[PDB]
Amino acid sequence: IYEDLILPNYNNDVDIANKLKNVKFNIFNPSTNYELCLFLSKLTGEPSLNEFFRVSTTPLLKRVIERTNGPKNTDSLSFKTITQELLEVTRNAPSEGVMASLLNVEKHAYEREYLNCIQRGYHPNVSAPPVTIEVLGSSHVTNSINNELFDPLISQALSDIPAITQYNMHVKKGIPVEDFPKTGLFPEPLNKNFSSNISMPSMDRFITESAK
Amino acid sequence: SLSLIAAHSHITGLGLDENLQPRPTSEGMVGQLQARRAAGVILKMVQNGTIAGRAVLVAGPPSTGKTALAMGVSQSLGKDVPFTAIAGSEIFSLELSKTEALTQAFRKSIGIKIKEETELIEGEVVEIQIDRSITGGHKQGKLTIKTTDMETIYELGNKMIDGLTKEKVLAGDVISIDKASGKITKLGRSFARSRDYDAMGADTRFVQCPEGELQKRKTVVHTVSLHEIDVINSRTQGFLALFTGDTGEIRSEVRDQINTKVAEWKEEGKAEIVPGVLFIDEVHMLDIECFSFINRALEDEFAPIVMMATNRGVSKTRGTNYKSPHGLPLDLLDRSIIITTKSYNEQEIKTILSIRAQEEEVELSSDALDLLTKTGVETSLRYSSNLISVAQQIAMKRKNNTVEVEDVKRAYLLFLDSARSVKYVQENESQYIDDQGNVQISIAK
Amino acid sequence: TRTAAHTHIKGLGLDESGVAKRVEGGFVGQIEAREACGVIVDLIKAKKMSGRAILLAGGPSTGKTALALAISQELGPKVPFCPLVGSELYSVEVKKTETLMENFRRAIGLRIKETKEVYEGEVTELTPEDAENPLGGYGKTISHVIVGLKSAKGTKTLRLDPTIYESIQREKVSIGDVIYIEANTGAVKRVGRSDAYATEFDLETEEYVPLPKGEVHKKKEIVQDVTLHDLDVANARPQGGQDVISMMGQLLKPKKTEITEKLRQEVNKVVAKYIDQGVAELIPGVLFIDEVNMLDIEIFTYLNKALESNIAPVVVLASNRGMTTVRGTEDVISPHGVPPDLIDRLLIVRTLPYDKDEIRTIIERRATVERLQVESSALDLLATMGTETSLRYALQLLAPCGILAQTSNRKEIVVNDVNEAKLLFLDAKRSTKILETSANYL
Amino acid sequence: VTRTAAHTHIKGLGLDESGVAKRVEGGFVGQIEAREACGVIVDLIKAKKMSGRAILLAGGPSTGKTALALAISQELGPKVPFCPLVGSELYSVEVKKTETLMENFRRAIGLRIKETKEVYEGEVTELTPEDAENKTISHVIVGLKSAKGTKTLRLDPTIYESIQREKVSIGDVIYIEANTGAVKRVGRSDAYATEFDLETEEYVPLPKGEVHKKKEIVQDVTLHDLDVANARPQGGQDVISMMGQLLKPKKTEITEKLRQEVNKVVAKYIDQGVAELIPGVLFIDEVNMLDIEIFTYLNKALESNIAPVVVLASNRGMTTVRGTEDVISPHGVPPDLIDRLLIVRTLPYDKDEIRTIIERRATVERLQVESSALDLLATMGTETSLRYALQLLAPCGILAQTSNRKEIVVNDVNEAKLLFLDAKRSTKILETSANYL
Ligand SMILES: Nc1ncnc2c1ncn2[C@@H]1O[C@H](COP(=O)(O)OP(=O)(O)O)[C@@H](O)[C@H]1O
Ligand SMILES: Nc1ncnc2c1ncn2[C@@H]1O[C@H](COP(=O)(O)OP(=O)(O)O)[C@@H](O)[C@H]1O
Ligand SMILES: Nc1ncnc2c1ncn2[C@@H]1O[C@H](COP(=O)(O)OP(=O)(O)O)[C@@H](O)[C@H]1O
């Protein structure tokens, strides 16, 4: 199944059809279809005309990760709606601000209702890994599922580089700061009690769990 | 030029004079003099473009030419004006509401025209040099872009440099830059350097080397419909929804702000609006909610001229339970001016069959044309239109290039029509499954 | 510019503290209805009372929508106006009650005043100034950052806190750029490079902003107007964070979601707080729901208590049907397609049909708005055909007469042109008369 | 052995080259007029000139209209695309139902592309990337070894990085494709097996052919594959992955815009001469199951610029059309659509045609039936149904094999009649008993 459907082979036609359906006939190809690319370049104000081909041929998580902070062209039809201007005007705003305090109610509800000291109430009963797939007699399957379970860009994006390591590449190895593999994109849990499902046995629960 | 010979491929346009009067036969359309004059009035009203929200209706018997007139006004309107031809059933969608689908079809039919001046610098690159002093001068470089004929040397900037090195650029890539905006187009590897590597990358493409002047300057015009601005403004990477259909009920404030921006953009003269025609074929299959939204969707200045077709007489309006003229409620028929088509005589039928025969490249004898005229008068126009091609197939199976009366006789024998099928069903009702589901499958009893 | 079966309504034309002038504001006739709409507009501009409802009753082509547009025009552009059809509510993405509630919250407008203390200009020199006693084992020790800004007839040197340096270094701020900072936040926003310093004249990417006007130090008073639905949809979607979930929400299609009462209550709480501070101003706006006969019964049931709420604005209702069954129920025959429980809550304004003189004045008003020159005899013929068939059939027939006059190179609308354009474009009555006598169910 | 189906005895329409239909040819018997009409429309599809031609087949059940449609699909050949369909699968939950109709329309129209496949194969003898910094390597030189000799290869840095992502070192066996630039490692060489006594690396022998193999293929696609390959919402089928994707994409409505640009690119590649357009056949069976909305979207979508030759098949008489309460019509087809159709009728058979059908079915399903058993089967077929006798033909074979007898006798047919009932006898027993049969 694997060696005749998924991997390329001399008698298989996977790679040929893949290129023929993803490159030769992609409608965002500037080599064949220029005017459509120039059309969207006028619309979205994109600086590079290959960006539509890049977006059309990138997985969603990977395209989410390499998010670009570059501003667009200023002659575009991308007209920033008043909600985006409201969100960007309060991106780093102090307290005692009229537009500042209107646009954060979740932090007010957090601080008012004391959500920083609440306790975990639910833990799941069974936790499992993804179901393992076991193909006998090939190392390509082992490499493929080990790469897919532990993709270093996705794993490193849900990660953090240690501080002395960031010292080591930034000063000792001289790596520029913007060329670091990006980290810290894992969502913050609500509390320290919500971080992990394991609950320690509490001394106070021993004190309070008895009638006598 | 991917098309084949369809039903409406002979209709090149509304065959009118300079004072809006139809010819007896010109530019495809035969007869229908009053309706064609009315459609020409409609076309001139579209081309003036100073009137918004008119609703017009084409009513007639089946196979009389309402969609023929619609394709005529579409072809006479020409390009760079947005024309949208939807059906009644395309409104009903599971994850996109019907009223908002009407809003999508309304905003897809009015365009705004923007002119742009381009200064194209396209040619094969040779060398990118390093003039920076530990990135001093903001990573300055020198470019060696060449066409076939002339070669020149430029100096680039920091944004230009990390734009290129963000791309996969090296010597041999056919690259393109705007002089003004600096937009980067990496077309691919030049075809002259074809045998540099025996194996090539997946994204690598082979482009011919550009020939002539480097700094060509061209002005392009852009005609964008008003729905596309909402598409690209609703999301972040919104251009995908222009092609994948997952717009998903764009909110009303986005449309409001875009209308305000279009009014500002036209007030300063940098853009102008181009109104079009929203053609709704088979409008009788809209329920009362679609009609109630259509009645108030034609009172805005950003509303195209809606043209509808209906072959139903006094019929039941869907979504309700009362009879009504045209299959439409009376409040909609109050707002609409109705263009009426009429049936044809034998002469109009034989000229239409002659045009459709020349369109499908079938040469006809006179007797076959008269027999097809009689069959078109008796049964229907479209059956005699359909008989021509199968008669041609019978002719080449007989090793004759032209069709005689014998081929039309054989095609009439082999392929039936509506009335003969009705008679041959009512003759032998027992062999057919019916409304009560009872049938005698056995042959002998 | 463009004629869209409207725009002669410049207002009610009501006189102050009295009757309406007969031909003011583009309105002809309807003295009682225009007086009622003037009273309603006065009550709305008082801004004292919330949760009211007005229904306009009358036949087709009477002018209820024109009355609503007159209300919105006489209120002014500061007052929000949300025109709505009854079929808009049935969304297959979110429930209909949430759709009506968000259309309620869209009508309420909020204005907030403030002051913006900013430094704007073109940077001529920025210095990460060093410090005495530079700690130990550190690449730099920035005591402060001096920046030199240049604007039109203005130049300043700003001694900033050290924390602006990493924002400067991140945003690629160098000498030869136009920037725009804020005082209290201290966050740099780079507009671009200055216009004069287009030095790399061969190839460039970054657009060159002109050198900014005004002084280098500006204290402007920006007044921004928002709706309550804007605040709700801003608080609902997660702002900031930029941690996978928000970025996936930005890249994927937005989904209309059931906004709970808690979010609206918190929004109302903070809005009332800044209203009591005296810096914000709240201004309710009307909501116009047309063809209200076509809402289901559960929408009316929700509207019974949504109307009774504290913050919901007035809502204007329009219906043309008479004795009919309410949609969504079996045999509740009720006036105007509105169930009788709602009828006691709302006030009813009846609009009367016109006659020949009002029809001809409306026709000539629409012709002047369309900029078409029509004589008196053609005006009388069009009035007689309008009384004979309908008002709208005469109103939509003016433009084909103008086209047919243009074909024969005549500026004037003449009787033979209106007869010919009548022969081109039939009336619904005569089309129906064809339909009953049609052989092929035309 | 091969598995016999209900239509595996059909091979072609069996008409002569002159257009006349032979009586017993091609797995068909009888049905002369419908076979001649189907041959004519086969020639019409082979002419490749018009779009939107529509054919409705008429007749009662067990008349072989599905056999006619499959005979058309086999007379055209495997190169011409064919999309068989039943009316009930147009209704979907993910995407709207007219969109499913347009998807099947674009599925029927097909494209033919020629292509060359160039493969480099063998053991990695040397691997030396030249950096030439001005981190970013300039290129890489790669030596590949096979049993017929060795070669050396020059590669761009992108395929070098892809080589690095298959953990390729010296001694590995790889797959290099010249055009697509895809890399697939096979395993370490057999000559490097004894470096350690036991190691996780899969050991594979050297390719006994040459390193450089070339072949020419003909990639046959349809327009649906083309306009779904870039109508992708989430992005990312270019990665080749085993585990499931994070977001499961839905079938989405395909706008007119992308279809127009796909038409533009296909027309450009056609004018470049690399492609050959071929119209196909969309065969929708059970047309009575179609809703009225699909009928009028079909009418509307039959007149588009590019459209296949649609063949329709129904058995109903004067029935109400589905979705409306009062419109009666022949064949369940509304009058506006039935004006556009050309109706071809299929006639029922007499007893000798049934006997010949049963004999040919007995030949193809690998049995041997005696003549008197064939006569009883023909009488049973005329009495009850053709399909009942055709399906009862095989349990006779099971009962004959049970008694170690290769030939079917009359007693086998009688015993199968006792074992299995038709619809009519079971309906009679259903009527006689009370408590739910
Ligand atoms: N004026 C005309 N000139 C030429 N052909 C016509 C004309 N009117 C109708 N037809 C023929 O009628 C067919 C389509 O008619 P159509 O407009 O679909 O009928 P209906 O108005 O009932 O929908 C086309 O194949 C076309 O050849
Ligand atoms: N009293 C009036 N004065 C001026 N114009 C009017 C008046 N009544 C109606 N009209 C015009 O008649 C046209 C149709 O009226 P409409 O608003 O559709 O009536 P309704 O509100 O009953 O639907 C509109 O363009 C409107 O401007
Ligand atoms: N003229 C014929 N010659 C040979 N076999 C036939 C003929 N007509 C029908 N059949 C056979 O009858 C079988 C069932 O017919 P089928 O197509 O299911 O009937 P229907 O047309 O009602 O669907 C088919 O497998 C076909 O092989």
UniProtKB/Swiss-Prot annotation, chain A:
It comes from the Eukaryota. It is found in: Nucleus. ATPase component of the INO80 complex which remodels chromatin by shifting nucleosomes and is involved in DNA repair. Its ability to induce transcription of some phosphate-responsive genes is modulated by inositol polyphosphates. The INO80 complex is involved in DNA repair by associating with 'Ser-129' phosphorylated H2A histones as a response to DNA damage. Belongs to the SNF2/RAD54 helicase family. Component of the chromatin-remodeling INO80 complex, at least composed of ARP4, ARP5, ARP8, RVB1, RVB2, TAF14, NHP10, IES1, IES3, IES4, IES6, ACT1, IES2, IES5 and INO80. The DBINO region is involved in binding to DNA. Present with 1110 molecules/cell in log phase SD medium. This is Chromatin-remodeling ATPase INO80. It comes from Saccharomyces cerevisiae (strain ATCC 204508 / S288c). The chain holds residues 1089 to 1300 of 1489 of the full protein.
Curated annotation (Swiss-Prot), chain B:
Keywords: Activator, ATP-binding, Chromatin regulator, DNA damage, DNA repair, Helicase, Hydrolase, Nucleotide-binding, Nucleus, rRNA processing, Transcription, Transcription regulation. It is found in: Nucleus, Nucleoplasm. Its EC number is 3.6.4.12. Its main location: nucleus. It catalyses: ATP + H2O = ADP + phosphate + H(+). One of its GO terms (cellular component) is Swr1 complex. One of its GO terms (molecular function) is ATP binding. One of its GO terms (biological process) is box C/D snoRNP assembly. InterPro entries: AAA+_ATPase, P-loop_NTPase, RuvB-like, RuvB-like_C, RuvBL1/2_DNA/RNA_bd_dom, TIP49_P-loop. Pfam families: TIP49, TIP49_C. It comes from the Eukaryota. Changing G65A: Growth defect at 37 degrees Celsius. ATP binds at G60, P61, P62, S63, T64, G65, K66, T67. Present with 3030 molecules/cell in log phase SD medium. Probably forms a homohexamer. Interacts with RVB1 and may form heterododecamers with RVB1. Component of the SWR1 chromatin remodeling complex composed of at least ACT1, ARP4, RVB1, RVB2, ARP6, YAF9, VPS71, VPS72, SWC3, SWC4, SWC5, SWC7 and SWR1, and perhaps BDF1. Component of the chromatin-remodeling INO80 complex, at least composed of ARP4, ARP5, ARP8, RVB1, RVB2, TAF14, NHP10, IES1, IES3, IES4, IES6, ACT1, IES2, IES5 and INO80. Also belongs to the R2TP complex composed of at least RVB1, RVB2, TAH1 and PIH1. Interacts with SPT15/TBP. DNA helicase which participates in several chromatin remodeling complexes, including the SWR1 and the INO80 complexes. The SWR1 complex mediates the ATP-dependent exchange of histone H2A for the H2A variant HZT1 leading to transcriptional regulation of selected genes by chromatin remodeling. The INO80 complex remodels chromatin by shifting nucleosomes. Its ability to induce transcription of some phosphate-responsive genes is modulated by inositol polyphosphates. The INO80 complex is involved in DNA repair by associating to 'Ser-129' phosphorylated H2A histones as a response to DNA damage.
UniProtKB/Swiss-Prot annotation, chain C:
Its EC number is 3.6.4.12. It is found in: Nucleus. It catalyses: ATP + H2O = ADP + phosphate + H(+). Keywords: Acetylation, Activator, ATP-binding, Chromatin regulator, DNA damage, DNA repair, Helicase, Hydrolase, Nucleotide-binding, Nucleus, Transcription, Transcription regulation. It comes from the Eukaryota. GO terms for molecular function: 5'-3' DNA helicase activity; ATP binding; ATP hydrolysis activity; DNA helicase activity. GO terms for cellular component: chromatin; Ino80 complex; NuA4 histone acetyltransferase complex; nucleus; R2TP complex; Swr1 complex; TTT Hsp90 cochaperone complex. ATP binds at G58, G59, P60, S61, T62, G63, K64, T65. InterPro entries: AAA+_ATPase (IPR003593), P-loop_NTPase (IPR027417), RuvB-like (IPR027238), RuvB-like_C (IPR041048), RuvBL1/2_DNA/RNA_bd_dom (IPR042487), TIP49_P-loop (IPR010339). Pfam families: TIP49, TIP49_C. GO terms for biological process: box C/D snoRNP assembly; chromatin remodeling; DNA repair; protein stabilization; regulation of DNA-templated transcription; regulation of transcription by RNA polymerase II. Probably forms a homohexamer. Interacts with RVB2 and may form heterododecamers with RVB2. Component of the SWR1 chromatin remodeling complex composed of at least ACT1, ARP4, RVB1, RVB2, ARP6, YAF9, VPS71, VPS72, SWC3, SWC4, SWC5, SWC7 and SWR1, and perhaps BDF1. Component of the chromatin-remodeling INO80 complex, at least composed of ARP4, ARP5, ARP8, RVB1, RVB2, TAF14, NHP10, IES1, IES3, IES4, IES6, ACT1, IES2, IES5 and INO80. Component of the R2TP complex composed of at least RVB1, RVB2, TAH1 and PIH1. Interacts with SPT15/TBP and HSP90. PANTHER family: RUVB-RELATED REPTIN AND PONTIN (PTHR11093). Belongs to the RuvB family. Present with 11600 molecules/cell in log phase SD medium. This is RuvB-like protein 1. The lineage of its organism: Eukaryota, Fungi, Dikarya, Ascomycota, Saccharomycotina.
